[PDB]
Amino acid sequence: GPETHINLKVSDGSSEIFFKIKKTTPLRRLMEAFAKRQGKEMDSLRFLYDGIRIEADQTPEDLDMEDNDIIEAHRSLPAERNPLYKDDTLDHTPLIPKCRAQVIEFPDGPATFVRLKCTNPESKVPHFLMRMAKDSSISATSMFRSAFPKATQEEEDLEMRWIRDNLNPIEDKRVAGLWVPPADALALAKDYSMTPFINALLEASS
Amino acid sequence: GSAEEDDELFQNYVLQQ
């Protein structure tokens, strides 16, 4: 558009902030301001416009932005993903019979889980995805460890903090990790490209 | 077979408390 200035909305999923800047101003300004105002570290965020990462020196003019366009502030995730998860769109029917229900004894006493063993096709390292039968809670910890082979402990800690701050986890005294309801598990599954696997795990017999 | 090991494996990882 012919306007000299532009209103832009930045959203991180939890909060939205509107900014008015001159179209010749580098977007560095807007990104740093969003991070500062939200009390987040710049290194923990990635800013996208129409699915493309924004570079700090790019201006709204450079990108041909329009008034009230939206910038998405995505959280950082580990750089590499399990090649098992290179297609989020596959139908999950064949994965359901791979799931298994298992009764585990605790001091008070038994609890039923559903699990799905997921093997990295390149390294052959396996991880289990885990579901609690009673409320269909899913271990977000199990999802993250399966999704990101080279994740550091710092990256895992950052992600579990994000889950606590943005989704609706529970703690079970009995079992470690962060457990989330089905809707939250499916939101994470999209983020981790694990949708068919979490679909299967959620539908499987307990 | 592998099923039993998977069962034992899984119980082990769940109880990683």
Numbering used by the authors:
A (entry chain A): 7 to 212
B (entry chain C): 2 to 18
Text taken from the publication that reported this structure:
Bqt4 is one of the most abundant INM proteins in fission yeast Schizosaccharomyces pombe, and plays crucial roles in chromosome-NE association by interacting with different protein partners. The Bqt4NTD comprises six α helices and six β strands arranged in a compact α/β fold. Overall, our data suggest that Bqt4NTD is a protein-interaction module that recognizes a consensus motif.
The data showed that Bqt4NTD interacted with a short fragment of Lem2 (residues 261–279), referred to as Lem2BBM. ITC assays confirmed that Lem2BBM could interact with Bqt4NTD with a Kd around 0.53 μM. Surprisingly, the complex structure of Bqt4NTD-Lem2BBM exhibits remarkable similarity with Bqt4NTD–Rap1BBM. All the hydrophobic contacts and electrostatic interactions are conserved in both complexes. Mutations of Bqt4F46A, Bqt4F61A, and Bqt4R48A decreased the interaction with Lem2BBM to different degrees, indicating that the observed interface in the crystal structure is essential for the interaction between Bqt4NTD and Lem2BBM.
